[PDB]
Paper text:
To further dissect the role of light chain patches in interacting with the N276 glycan, we determined the crystal structure at 3.25 Å resolution of Fab VRC01 bound to an engineered gp120 outer domain (eOD) that contains a Man9GlcNAc2 glycan at position 276 (eOD-N276Kif). The VRC01 interactions with the N276 glycan contribute an additional 550Å2 of buried surface area to the previously defined epitope, and an additional 229 Å2 of buried surface area compared to the 45-46m2+gp120 structure with a shorter Man4GlcNAc2 glycan at position 276, due to a significantly different glycan conformation, several new H-bonds, and increased stacking interactions with TyrL28. All three L-FW3 affinity-matured residues (ArgL66, TrpL67 and ProL69) and two of the L-CDR1 affinity-matured residues (TyrL28 and GlyL29) directly contact the N276 glycan. Together, the Man9GlcNAc2 N276 glycan interactions constitute a third of the antibody paratope surface area. The two-residue deletion in L-CDR1 eliminates a steric clash between the germline-VRC01 L-CDR1 and the GlcNAc2 base of the N276 glycan. Steric clashes between germline VRC01 L-FW3 and the N276 Man9GlcNAc2 D2 arm are alleviated by mutations in mature VRC01. Structural comparisons with other VRC01-class bnAbs co-crystallized with core gp120 suggest that all VRC01-class antibodies have evolved similar mutations to avoid and/or utilize the N276 glycan. Fully-solvated molecular dynamics simulations of eOD with a complex biantennary glycan at N276 suggest that mammalian glycoforms other than oligomannose species could also be accommodated by VRC01-class bnAbs. This structure and these analyses thus improve our understanding of VRC01-class interactions with the N276 glycan.
Residue numbers in the entry:
A (entry chain H): 1 to 52, 52A, 53 to 82, 82A, 82B, 82C, 83 to 100, 100A, ...
B (entry chain A): 2 to 171
C (entry chain L): 2 to 30, 33 to 91, 96 to 213
């Protein structure tokens, strides 16, 4: 029964180096090529490289060419992944894998439990809140250009529950999250009641209150 | 005439003809502008499965093996599989000469000609015209990283770092 | 060489078939990996149609030309999650088979929001398209500027199926900068949905 046990989850600062181990038992270690694959949230799975234990033959993925280095120890049946010059993009759960059959390498039957890494820059970007205004009417707030996740909006400090829809954030090419939060209210109400959304962003300790005037 | 940093120094009778070589292909893709190739990265089973080998046990470079007729012939189980080693056989051999002083000389111009042939055949397999890069090994044991062979029951380690450092266009 | 999976998010109730498609750009055996939430991903299908270990016969792979299908005949809780397709070292973007309570069809109430003047000063301009309370989740939003389609400049998001409503809401964030925005005077958001007879359009002038 093949087992791929790897290191525990790590927290790293940007620009630092990282080492992760993965030892395996249940099969003869030297026989099968070993791969590393990182999975980022809302992102394509990414193959990092493979490593052939008999002679330490190695093949690094071209995007990572400079910053990736993986080695092996034959005697304790283990492989090590090393990632230098960390960036916030590199936050992912890192898996060591081995194929089903010993040399068709790509049918990844066996995965580790995963080693989650979290590089997070102490630099944070406060939310920019922009109103959205018009039988029934809708008015909301655009929480644009903030970093990182998450923010939690509300309306009238919680007086408004019904009709409110807050949306999952969206990663713009800017690298900064922008979400929207709308509410549907009666058309008449636009004149009678004032509508304030309360954007709360703990990573920056910013807590913006914004009004949506008709 | 390129020379080889060699450890230890190889006696004259160890000087021989080069027949072929082993190329591992770097995993893609970026943009299919170019392909990176490195020596070795091949297990002994890949070498045996290649069937062109001679008597000499070696890494990266086939020695004292059988040549193939007319054109350089490249073979792999699957070329689109970068985990599979590429076997290269030459019609014209390349006489690697060891002085015994510790540096193995080689005809630079001739090795340029053979390399151009390989790159041409690689393009034939990997698409009409992709620029081809030859770089040194990514890493591993000295036997895989350095060109390592056996002569008279004694092992020798030569660095092909000088050798594999080219780039070809079309 | 890239792998394109469709749909991005397939959603439907337990007890009915789910079908996932993966478009390839080259030859080579293709695999299918299931990934349950929080758990490591699991190899479902390899070499096109052969199932891995512990995979029931409810999973089948189908191939025609460059296209591959993973069909899960009878949806159980354990089947829901996110599926990826693979060809050598490359993966597809992913698909998310998620649960969906069946209810009556509802047409979306659409609103369009011009960009905040303060944002306009900052240099950027974000036009928002709101689609509220519609069933089912599959609905298409088309951005046109001076009656001209747009691609890649816009982004989207859909709510979790709201418990009371059992209905989906969508937000389309159309993003520009001040220059291009002021140039074009008039903008329109086009919504085509199952509960809609005709593509409802919501537009405005600068
Ligand atoms: C590394 O390894 C990988 C594997 O891991 C290798 O990948 C394999 O590579 C093979 C060769 O390169 C490749 O075979 C090709 O596949 C072609 C496409 O096959 C699919 O599409 C067929 C229908 O296509 C039609 O429609 C699409 C789009 O709609 C168009 O693109 C096409 O042009 C057509 O218009 C479809 O029939 C086929 O399924 C059959 O094959 C499957 C095998 O996996 C079966 O499961 C399936 O049931 C079908 O089987 C039927 O047909 C076979 C005979 O092919 C028969 O045995 C069965 O009983 C059943 O009847 C796929 O869905 C395909 O077009 C190619 O076929 C032509 O060429 C061969 C010669 O190679 C001829 O013998 C054949 O008759 C046919 O002739 C055509 O071409 C002639 C000249 O080439 C021409 O004269 C003639 O008029 C015809 O046009 C061929 O089979 C594999 O698909 C591929 N495998 C995978 C998984 O991707 C890879 O190559 C390796 N890498 C390297 C570098 O070597
Ligand atoms: C290879 O062959 C040559 C001559 O054919 C011979 O001198 C040499 O000893 C052989 N072995 C090696 C390792 O060069
Ligand atoms: C290599 O082969 C050639 C002819 O094929 C022969 O003349 C030469 O002696 C051989 N050995 C060396 C070291 O070149």
């Amino acid at each position: 029964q093949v087992q791929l046990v790897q290191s525990g989850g790590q927290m790293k600062k940007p620009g630092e180096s990282m080492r992760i181990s993965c030892r395996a038992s249940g099969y003869e270690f030297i026989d099968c090529t070993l791969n590393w694959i990182r999975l980022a949230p809302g992102k394509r799975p990414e193959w990092m490289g493979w490593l052939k234990p008999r002679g330490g033959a190695v093949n690094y993925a071209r995007p990572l060419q400079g910053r990736v280095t993986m080695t092996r120890d034959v005697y304790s049946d283990t492989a090590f992944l090393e990632l230098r010059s960390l960036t916030v993009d590199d936050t992912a759960v890192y898996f060591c894998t081995r194929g089903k059959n010993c040399d068709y390498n790509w049918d990844f039957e066996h995965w580790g439990r995963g080693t989650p890494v979290i590089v997070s820059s102490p630099s944070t970007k406060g939310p920019s809140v922009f109103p959205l205004a018009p039988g029934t009417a809708a008015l909301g707030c655009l929480v644009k250009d903030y970093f990182p996740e998450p923010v939690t909006v509300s309306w009238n400090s919680g007086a408004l529950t019904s009709g409110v829809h807050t949306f999952p954030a969206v990663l713009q090419s800017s690298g900064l999250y922008s979400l929207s939060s709308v509410v549907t209210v009666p058309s008449s109400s636009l004149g009678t009641q004032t509508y304030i959304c309360n954007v709360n962003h703990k990573p920056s300790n910013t807590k913006v209150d914004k009004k949506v005037e008709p | 005439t390129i020379t080889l940093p060699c450890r230890p120094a190889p006696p004259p009778h160890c000087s021989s003809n080069i027949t072929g070589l082993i190329l591992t292909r770097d995993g893609g893709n970026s943009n299919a502008e170019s392909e990176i190739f490195r020596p070795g990265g091949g297990d002994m089973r890949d070498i045996a499965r290649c069937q062109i080998a001679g008597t000499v046990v070696s890494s990266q470079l086939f020695l004292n093996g059988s040549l193939a007729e007319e054109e350089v012939v490249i073979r792999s189980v699957n070329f689109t599989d970068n985990a599979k080693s590429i076997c290269v056989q030459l019609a014209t051999s390349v006489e690697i000469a060891c002085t015994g002083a510790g540096h193995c000389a080689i005809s630079r111009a001739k090795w340029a000609n053979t390399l151009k042939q390989i790159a041409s055949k690689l393009r034939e397999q990997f698409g009409n015209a992709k620029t081809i890069i030859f770089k040194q090994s990514s890493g591993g044991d000295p036997e895989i990283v350095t060109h390592w062979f056996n002569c008279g029951g004694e092992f020798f380690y030569c660095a092909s770092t000088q050798l594999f450092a080219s780039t070809w266009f079309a | 060489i890239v792998l394109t999976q469709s749909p991005g998010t397939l959603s439907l109730s337990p007890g009915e078939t789910a079908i996932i498609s993966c478009r390839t750009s080259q030859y080579g055996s293709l695999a299918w990996y299931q990934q349950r939430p929080g758990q490591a991903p699991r190899l479902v299908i390899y070499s096109g149609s052969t199932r891995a270990a512990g995979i029931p016969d409810r999973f089948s792979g189908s191939r025609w030309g460059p296209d591959y299908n993973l069909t899960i005949s009878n949806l159980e809780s354990g089947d829901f999650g996110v599926y990826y397709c693979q060809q050598y070292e490359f993966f597809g973007q992913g698909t998310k088979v998620q649960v969906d309570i069946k209810r009556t069809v509802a047409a979306p109430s659409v609103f369009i929001f011009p960009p905040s003047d303060e944002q306009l000063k900052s240099g950027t301009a974000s036009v928002v398209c709101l689609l509220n309370n519609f069933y089912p989740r599959e609905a298409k939003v088309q951005w046109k500027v001076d009656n001209a389609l747009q691609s890649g400049n816009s982004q989207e998001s859909v709510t979790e199926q709201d418990s009371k409503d059992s209905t989906y809401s969508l937000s389309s964030t159309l993003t520009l900068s001040k220059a291009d925005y002021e140039k074009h005077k008039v903008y329109a958001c086009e919504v085509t949905h199952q509960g809609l007879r005709s593509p409802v359009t919501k537009s405005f002038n600068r």
